[PDB]
Amino acid sequence: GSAQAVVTQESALTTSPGETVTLTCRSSTGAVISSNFVSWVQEKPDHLFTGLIGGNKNRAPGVPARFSGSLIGDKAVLTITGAQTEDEAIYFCALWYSNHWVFGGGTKLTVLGQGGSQVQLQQPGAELAKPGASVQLSCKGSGYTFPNYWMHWVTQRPGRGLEWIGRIDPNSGFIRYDERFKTKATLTVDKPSSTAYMQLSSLTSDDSAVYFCARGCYGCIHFDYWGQGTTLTVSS
Numbered sequence: 001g002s003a004q005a006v007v008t009q010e011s012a013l014t015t016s017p018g019e020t021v022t023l024t025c026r027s028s029t030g031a032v033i034s035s036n037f038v039s040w041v042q043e044k045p046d047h048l049f050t051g052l053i054g055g056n057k058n059r060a061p062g063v064p065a066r067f068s069g070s071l072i073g074d075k076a077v078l079t080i081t082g083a084q085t086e087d088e089a090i091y092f093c094a095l096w097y098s099n100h101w102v103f104g105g106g107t108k109l110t111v112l113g114q115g116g117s118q119v120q121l122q123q124p125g126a127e128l129a130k131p132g133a134s135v136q137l138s139c140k141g142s143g144y145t146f147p148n149y150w151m152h153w154v155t156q157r158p159g160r161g162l163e164w165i166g167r168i169d170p171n172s173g174f175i176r177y178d179e180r181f182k183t184k185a186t187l188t189v190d191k192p193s194s195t196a197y198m199q200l201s202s203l204t205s206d207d208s209a210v211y212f213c214a215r216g217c218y219g220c221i222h223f224d225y226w227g228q229g230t231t232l233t234v235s236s
Ligand SMILES: O=C(O)CNC(=O)Cc1ccc(O)c([N+](=O)[O-])c1
Pocket: 034, 035, 037, 096, 167, 176, 216, 217, 218, 219, 220
């Protein structure tokens, strides 16, 4: 039913200031439904992510009014009503499928005409490990009440899309792993230091990627705020 759940987005779109942009997000399992509790996020160069929409239709505080999300027919839709040059980015949707998140493949939006944050998630820039070893990645949540939010982990392999790893609730300790990562990743947290940790084990060159933390919580704007991403390189 859902073991091959795949989320599809437009490959690319081109716009210019003042145009309206429609980005869509389709589920292989059927219509996108309210239970899929869709988030939309934006990636700008050097893998800088910002959450835009959560819960299908909720615009995150601070996000420009020109962004809006809805479920229309059988798809999730992000509309930019009056594009701006700073909107040039890759846009990803994310759907909740019972017990894990699935990201779409992303839409590259080009905008013709080219040319601090209270909440911070703090990740190291880079790590390097040898194959067969394990490595610790950290993410310190700054400027918000850390136990009140889950910490999601996500990866982007070089040149490719986003993959959800899992999440941890610091308050209850509850962990979810994606089936893709349940033997690769181990999540822990420490409340007094407001730090989430992810151990990646049995490393291979396939694990060379950027690894992000991002906030969530039940009914919240999942993936609203992101760490910068730690680049892990696995090499002898
Ligand atoms: O349907 C609603 O009203 C709110 N839905 C959500 O927030 C989506 C959700 C639900 C449970 C859960 O454990 C996770 N997760 O990320 O682990 C995410």
